[PDB]
Design a protein around this ligand. Structure first.
Ligand SMILES: Cc1n[nH]cc1CNc1ccccc1F
Length: 119
């Protein structure tokens, strides 16, 4: 029933993601000195610190918006990887599976609470 509960649920999930070793390449914006052509390939960079800061600033209205940005981290990894077997892309696949497994109930609970609110 709680329309606001998603926010703390997303903070807790982001805390788990930051503890997870697989998130290391995704915690901060990609450094252009390390990957000089990054912006030639990726139009909209995204990383977990930016997601956490957007959430803490009160700049997400729903968990769907946060999901869209987290999914952008993973699609940017798939777009920039030179191979489906690269280290960083393999880490992104595992982290994405972990994220999707945990975000499902957050999204479901929010959409149910909102449908109850508008009944
Ligand atoms: C993100 C990010 N973190 N660290 C480097 C990058 C750039 N992306 C990337 C690079 C190589 C293989 C696979 C990839 F997705």
């Amino acid at each position: 029933y709680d329309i606001q509960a998603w926010k703390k649920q997303c903070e807790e999930l982001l805390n788990l993601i930051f503890q997870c070793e697989d998130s290391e390449p995704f915690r901060q914006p990609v450094d252009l000195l390390e990957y000089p052509d990054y912006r030639d390939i990726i139009d909209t960079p995204m990383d977990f610190a930016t997601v956490r800061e957007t959430l803490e600033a009160g700049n997400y209205e729903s968990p769907m918006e946060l999901c869209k940005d987290v999914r952008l981290i993973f699609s940017n990894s798939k777009a920039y990887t030179p191979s489906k077997r690269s280290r960083i892309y393999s880490m992104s696949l595992r982290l994405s599976a972990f994220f999707e497994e945990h975000i499902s109930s957050v999204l479901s609970d929010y959409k149910s609470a909102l449908r109850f609110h508008k009944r």
